Design a binder for this molecule. Structure first.
Ligand code: AGS
Ligand code: MG
Ligand code: ZN
Lengths: 49, 628
């Protein structure tokens, strides 16, 4: 689908913004292992230190 | 005079008889003898122990049983029943002297001891108070509707004279009528005297409306209501909505020029409360040891699962979600910059007749700060913050709503589907920011709404359709559906054995309830939940990170392959939060591996059962290792 086909509004608001960011789910093991470890260190307290 | 001389009366009325100084001093002496010499033939003086207890607790309330006085001096009990006001004043003085017999410095601390008569025999409903009960002691039951704030009423009234500035002596304010002084005794003038509040002493005052309890009212009749005045020590005792029993003097409220609308010389009636009796999440030193003893059992958690809603049968995963929501995780804020929510939000989506409302009522009974609200209903606390002006009081008040009111607690929203737009927005903000921002009537602020939410909903069309996924069965949109940690879909599929056991359970519940006819006890369980919520705060350590990260990728790649709605990071956070909630039921300071496995089971079961049946068949076989 087009980027204006996924928005639930007109395409003029997209031109109205200064910087748009299309944020992805990369859907692979090498990234979500790192994300899972980051969140576990957040919950543990290592990331605070 | 003697007791037999007290039996005979000479004055026209009982009140004039007690008003005489000789009868008053005789009654004072007899009450002193009764208070100092009453024993229950067991060698102990209960009233001396009561005086010692009230002295050591620094309290102005003395509980005197009516049957003790009736057995001791029946004529004084009859005098108290007929003319309670001045005899209570006499026994106030007597009890004060009895207290000063033990503690000689108690007068400067209090200078007032209130005697509370308990176990009055005659029982009256509010619908049977009549002409004969005026200026007499009545014991009436009922439900408190609403109560006023605590106001200062003048007790020891002190004046000053405008002519000379001299400050006059203190005078006792009778509760019946206003007192006034006409002389100065310094400049000998009848000039305008003014009450100065800095040297005037006050008592507390409350006004409480009591209605007849709706269970006891005759069929066609409306519940009668009376108004009860609570004095200094009895203020803020009975909260509205509870059945209470008040003993007090039934008397007339005096008003100017009577009532012009009636055209008849009609007075209103009040009850000046003598005693209040109620017809608590405090753990003692033995209670915490009992909690530690019951926590060290290996199968404690399952017992809590078996303790959730005994009247509800067979919904074990729903009860597990209830236990997780009641105990809850721990909130956290790493470096102040990043906040992780620490309470489990449970959505019970079910067909009619799956007893979701009874589960909500059970949680309302069990939880500490539980607030019940609904979308379609009217006579309930709203979910939206507001600034409301009373039409009569003309006072602007800030209502935080059910979400702010359930802070550090649980909010139970029945009928989550037919909510309106403002309540949906309130729920969305209360789950995103855990706060509610108001800009109304010049008030711009934010209110903390750190509340767990246990919501109940009906699917679209009255049935869950397993062919369609969850989002198409519920009117709730994707962001509000994603905020729930446990997502219990319950459906009443036809199973013969399950139907037989359910029907047996319900019919047995009816036949136990007829008027002619291993679970933890509820009282222990409620304090256990409060204790585990308020003192445990579990924590997970670093060497378990290799398995949660493993199983996270294991669910994510399978969710990609199967093609359902994706597993995000929030499912991992829900795992880690449900683990911390399960660890609280063990009263454990750390998170164990079986704890994490049970949380993973809960999250996997909650994610699988909300799917299309094609997704269900693959996901059940792929995640068989984690469901076990
Ligand atoms: N599993 C069950 N165990 C015991 N009683 C049950 C069970 N399921 C239904 N009931 C009874 O059936 C009735 C259903 O009442 P509700 O709790 O109001 O049902 P509901 O789940 O709230 O569905 P609604 O009202 O359409 S939202 C009550 O009398 C329950 O006691
Ligand atoms: Mg219901
Ligand atoms: Zn004067």
């Amino acid at each position: 689908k087009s980027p204006g086909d996924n928005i639930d509004f007109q395409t003029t608001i997209l031109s109205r913004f200064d910087m748009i960011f299309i944020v992805k789910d990369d859907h692979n093991e090498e990234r979500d292992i790192s994300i899972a470890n980051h969140v576990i260190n957040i919950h543990t307290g290592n990331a605070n230190a | 005079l003697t007791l037999e001389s007290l039996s005979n009366v000479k004055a026209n009325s009982y009140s004039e008889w007690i008003t005489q100084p000789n009868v008053s001093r005789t009654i004072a002496r007899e009450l002193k003898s009764f208070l100092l010499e009453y024993t229950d033939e067991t060698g102990r003086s209960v009233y001396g122990a009561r005086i010692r207890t009230l002295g050591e607790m620094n309290s102005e309330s003395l509980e005197v049983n009516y049957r003790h006085l009736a057995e001791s001096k029946a004529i004084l009990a009859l005098f108290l029943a007929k003319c309670p006001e001045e005899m209570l004043k006499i026994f106030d003085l007597v009890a004060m002297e009895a207290t000063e017999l033990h503690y000689p410095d108690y007068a400067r601390i209090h200078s007032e001891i209130h005697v509370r008569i308990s176990d009055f025999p005659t029982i009256y409903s509010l619908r049977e108070l009549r002409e004969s009960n005026l200026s007499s002691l009545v014991r009436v039951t009922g439900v408190v509707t609403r109560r006023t704030g605590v106001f200062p009423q003048l007790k020891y009234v002190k004046f000053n004279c405008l002519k000379c500035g001299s400050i006059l002596g203190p005078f006792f304010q009778d509760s019946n009528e206003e007192i006034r002084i006409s002389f100065c005794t310094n400049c000998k003038s009848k000039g305008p005297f003014r009450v100065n509040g800095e040297k005037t002493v006050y008592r507390n005052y409350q006004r409480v409306t009591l209605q007849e309890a709706p269970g006891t009212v005759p069929p066609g009749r409306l519940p009668r209501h009376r108004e009860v005045i609570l004095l200094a020590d009895l203020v803020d005792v009975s909260k509205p909505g509870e059945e209470v029993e008040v003993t007090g003097i039934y008397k007339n409220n005096y008003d100017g020029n009577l009532n012009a609308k009636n055209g008849f010389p009609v007075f209103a009636t009040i009850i000046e409360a003598n005693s209040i009796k109620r017809r608590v999440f405090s753990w003692t030193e033995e209670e915490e040891r009992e909690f530690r003893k019951i926590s060290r059992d290996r199968g404690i958690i399952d017992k809590i699962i078996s303790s959730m809603a005994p009247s509800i049968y067979g919904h074990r995963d729903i009860k597990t979600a209830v236990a997780c929501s009641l105990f809850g995780g721990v909130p956290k804020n790493v470096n102040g910059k990043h906040s992780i929510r620490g309470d489990i939000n449970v959505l019970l989506l079910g067909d009619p007749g799956t007893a979701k409302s009874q589960i909500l009522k059970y949680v309302e009974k069990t939880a500490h700060r539980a607030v019940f609200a609904t979308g379609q209903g009217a006579s309930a606390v709203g979910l939206t913050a507001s600034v409301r002006k009373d039409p009569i009081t003309k006072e602007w008040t800030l209502e935080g709503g059910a979400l702010v009111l359930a802070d550090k607690g649980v909010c139970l929203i029945d009928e989550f589907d037919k909510m309106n737009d403002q309540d949906r927005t309130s729920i969305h903000e209360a789950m995103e920011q855990q706060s509610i921002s108001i800009s109304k009537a010049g008030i711009v602020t934010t209110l903390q709404a750190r509340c767990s939410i246990i919501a109940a909903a009906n699917p679209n069309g009255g049935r869950y359709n397993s062919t369609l996924p969850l989002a198409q069965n519920v009117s709730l949109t994707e962001p509000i559906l994603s905020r729930f940690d446990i997502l219990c879909v319950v459906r009443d599929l036809v199973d013969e054995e399950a139907d037989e056991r359910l029907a047996t359970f319900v019919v047995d519940s009816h036949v136990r309830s007829h008027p002619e006819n291993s679970p933890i006890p509820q009282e222990l369980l409620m304090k256990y939940i409060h204790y585990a919520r308020t003192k445990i705060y579990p924590k997970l350590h670093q060497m378990d990170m290799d398995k949660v990260s493993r199983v996270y990728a294991d669910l994510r790649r399978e969710s990609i392959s199967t093609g359902s709605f994706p597993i995000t990071v929030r499912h991992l956070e829900s795992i880690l939060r449900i683990a911390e909630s399960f660890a609280k039921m063990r009263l454990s300071e750390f998170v164990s591996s079986y704890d994490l496995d049970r949380a993973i089971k809960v999250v996997v079961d909650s994610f699988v059962d909300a799917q299309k049946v094609s997704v269900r068949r693959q996901l059940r076989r792929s995640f068989a290792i984690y469901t076990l």
